[PDB]
Write a protein that binds this ligand. Structure first.
Ligand SMILES: Nc1ncnc2c1ncn2[C@@H]1O[C@H](COP(=O)(O)OP(=O)(O)OP(O)(O)=S)[C@@H](O)[C@H]1O
Ligand SMILES: Nc1ncnc2c1ncn2[C@@H]1O[C@H](COP(=O)(O)OP(=O)(O)OP(O)(O)=S)[C@@H](O)[C@H]1O
Ligand SMILES: [Mg+2]
Ligand SMILES: [Mg+2]
Lengths: 444, 456
């Protein structure tokens, strides 16, 4: 399952100084996709991100490419070189009302009126298409303020007409809250697991997306997929990626969380989870750390704990064949799970999330340093070759330790008591190959 | 002995085709109608598989053989029978004019523009026709340039009536899901169990026969055993048999799931058990099936909980509480028979056993035919050769093998399928078939290959 060439799949190309509402295509491409000048289009990027734009022709734009500015790439969670999908969006209505909020670090200090100084001049007679979850930057006077679209009516996208009511009242959105959102886990955040991600897409995503395919040939797909492997191999990471990437409804069940609940409450929450997924099908239930709620019925010295395992088995069996629900699970102790849960029609398929090789280790090292300030002498392939037996969690800690050693090297220019860290200390900070070699030497 | 085989009776006929025939009409030969005292236009009751019924009008037919009954696809579909199957026919004189009927469309036949369902479809279909209909009937109607499938949801009188001019036809409500009816159509019957001919006979003689004909046992002066335990290794079709019995039996059927009872609160587990036996008693003749008995009734030694011992005591009291006039038979299943409390296996409790074991080559072929009947097979697929290469496999292993062959066939087309597409390419869909190569691949992928060693 690799990405297929389709006429509406295009490579993200730059458009410096371009308006936030505009994407550019070549004329022959627009002709092919039956797209006309001014048409409203729907763009799809990574981690289920969407953007609504106006399409314009461009003779400097290659057929296979789409030009878009930084703000739009940021909304689609894509980089230059990435592939997006484009489709016509004819059903977009004039907005009745929209609610936007400023990002807190762009509104620090003197303000004036956000609507009058920023939003009114930005939207004025422009008829901008916008989507809930859009981030956009506006210049007003001598200042820049970043806004988030929090709600639209109609939802989740509309055109901001002259009659659209623009709301900007409320407590500003925290930069840190949106940073966590921007850097939510995607499939690109999982390294050294290419074959496993393919197994998961074919056993989980494919039957939920295309149940016609399986009915056609006359096969019922397996409904229980167990990910197994040693600690820190990225089982929970994969759960998070699936959560953020899937077209289906996703309900996470945390083993320890259910087991922390009162007697009766543990079983109740389990029932509530399966009910919610059924109602919202197609759906994925992920039961993380399955061994916590479902150990061998021998290794249980409590009535409630045996009761909980019975509850899960009944819920698995209770998933009638028309429910369009797939249950995923993860464990670092697969031999410790009750054998009854691994029977036909339950968790009958398995995915080994194991120890990565040298190439996989390099993938993980690239992922965890992508937002890290690296010096030019840093050779990550050489780091990859020196970390045999390491899993993804060991490699994350190694990168962290190199970084902390880099900070430790400047504690003779840093005073803890200071209100502010010295600017040159801040701007010069980089992790060296020496910091990595030190981290490699410090060890498990 | 598998001696309970289907007997030749005058009203038992072989299902034969009637292309272009009306949904309300069945055809018999004249001598057959004479024999059964059936006249032209008489209303008849047809009985098929899985307790399915159909009410039709009978007409004579000189092209129809004496031993056969002609019926169209819609009627066969309602009786859950194929060409070649046997059905029973009987006069149905007590059928009254309906006061009201409620029908609902199937959702994939009503996608898009509609008009008026009653006016365009149902009124012209029923108009002056005096059609007999039964609750649970599925029928197709042509109206304008379109076809819409309907389900009879309720009749008054229930469960069948004649749709007269004065019968009120209701078609309001949310359309019935095709998937939901597909689940119903393919509910488990005895034909869905392969490699268990002798065991199905044991079950019919120990369960069905005493519930159906308690006079037979009273006459000879014998009390039939009331506790039947099915045992055998994982995936041999014990739960499958429970489902088949549930759908085939003339008795009331109450399922008790072991794990389900054990998932309940203290006190609630025992309460549900009492409720199950009470419900079956009230609705006798009845079958109680306790699936996975070992879950609720392990050896009173292997219990480190007061409630779990309490639950076993509860079951024993309920078994003993079944007085000899209750006309209730308790079936159970387990893959751990040695792990059940010995007290439950005493006289007058679970004192009879049925070994649901490992099938032989011929049994395996039966299972392979059942699980591929709704599967698109290429012509090179030799299921007998598959049967001969799956020694040590049980029914569950054969189901997984068939699934894996099909999934491999889909996997072979992932270079023509994009995950992100809204629709799968039509020619990819229409050409999809499972090959003998897909099966050979599946046979090589294995706890098949690792399983042929085991049972020699
Ligand atoms: N394949 C991977 N690619 C990139 N980072 C990884 C990978 N595996 C682990 N990591 C990093 O290590 C962290 C911890 O990994 P988790 O996914 O929580 O481990 P896990 O496999 O769920 O371990 P258990 O069994 O819960 S102790 C992740 O948040 C990642 O930052
Ligand atoms: N004798 C059989 N004939 C046809 N299909 C079978 C047979 N046995 C098993 N199967 C298939 O395998 C599936 C699982 O069988 P079950 O009846 O659930 O197994 P079981 O004997 O109840 O296993 P345990 O003991 O609960 S683990 C069924 O739904 C069928 O699809
Ligand atoms: Mg984890
Ligand atoms: Mg079973």
């Amino acid at each position: 399952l690799k990405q297929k060439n389709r006429p509406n799949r295009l490579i993200v190309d730059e458009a410096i100084n371009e308006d936030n509402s505009v994407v550019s295509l070549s004329q022959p491409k627009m002709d092919e996709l039956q797209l006309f000048r001014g048409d409203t289009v729907l763009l799809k990027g990574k981690k289920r991100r969407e953007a609504v734009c106006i399409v314009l022709s461009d003779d400097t734009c290659s057929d296979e490419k789409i030009r878009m500015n930084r703000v739009v790439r940021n909304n689609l969670r894509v980089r230059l070189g990435d592939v997006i999908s484009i489709q016509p969006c004819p059903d977009v209505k004039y907005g009745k009302r929209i609610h936007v909020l400023p990002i807190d670090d762009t509104v620090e200090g003197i303000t004036g009126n956000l609507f009058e100084v920023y939003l009114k001049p930005y939207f004025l007679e422009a008829y901008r298409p916008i989507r809930k979850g859009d981030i956009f930057l506006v210049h007003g006077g001598m200042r820049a303020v970043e806004f988030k679209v929090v709600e639209t009516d109609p939802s989740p996208y509309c055109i901001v007409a002259p009659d659209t009511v623009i709301h900007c009242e409320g407590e500003p959105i925290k930069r840190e809250d949106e940073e966590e959102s921007l850097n939510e886990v995607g499939y690109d955040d999982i390294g050294g697991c290419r074959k496993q991600l393919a197994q998961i897409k074919e056993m989980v995503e494919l039957p939920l997306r295309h149940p016609a395919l399986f009915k056609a040939i006359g096969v019922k797909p397996p409904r229980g997929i167990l990910l197994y492997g040693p600690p820190g191999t990225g089982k929970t990471l994969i759960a998070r990626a699936v959560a953020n990437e899937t077209g289906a409804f996703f309900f996470l069940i945390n083993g320890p969380e259910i087991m922390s609940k009162l007697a009766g409450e543990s079983e109740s929450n389990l029932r509530k989870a399966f009910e919610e997924a059924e109602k919202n099908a197609p759906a994925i239930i992920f039961i993380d750390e399955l061994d916590a709620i479902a150990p061998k019925r021998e290794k249980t010295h409590g009535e409630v704990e045996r009761r909980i395992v019975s509850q899960l088995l009944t819920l698995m069996d209770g998933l009638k064949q028309r429910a369009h629900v797939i249950v995923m699970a993860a464990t670092n102790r697969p031999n410790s799970i009750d054998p009854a849960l691994r029977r036909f029609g339950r968790f009958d398929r398995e995915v080994d999330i194991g120890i990565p090789d040298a190439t996989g280790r390099l993938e993980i090292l690239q992922i965890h340093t992508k937002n890290m300030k690296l010096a030019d002498d840093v050779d990550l392939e050489q780091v990859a070759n020196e970390t045999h037996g390491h899993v993804g969690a060991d490699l994350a800690a190694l990168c962290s330790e190199a970084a902390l050693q880099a900070i430790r090297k400047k504690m003779d220019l840093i005073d803890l008591e200071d209100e502010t860290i010295d600017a040159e200390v801040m701007n010069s900070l980089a992790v060296t190959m020496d910091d990595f070699r030190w981290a490699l030497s410090q060890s498990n």
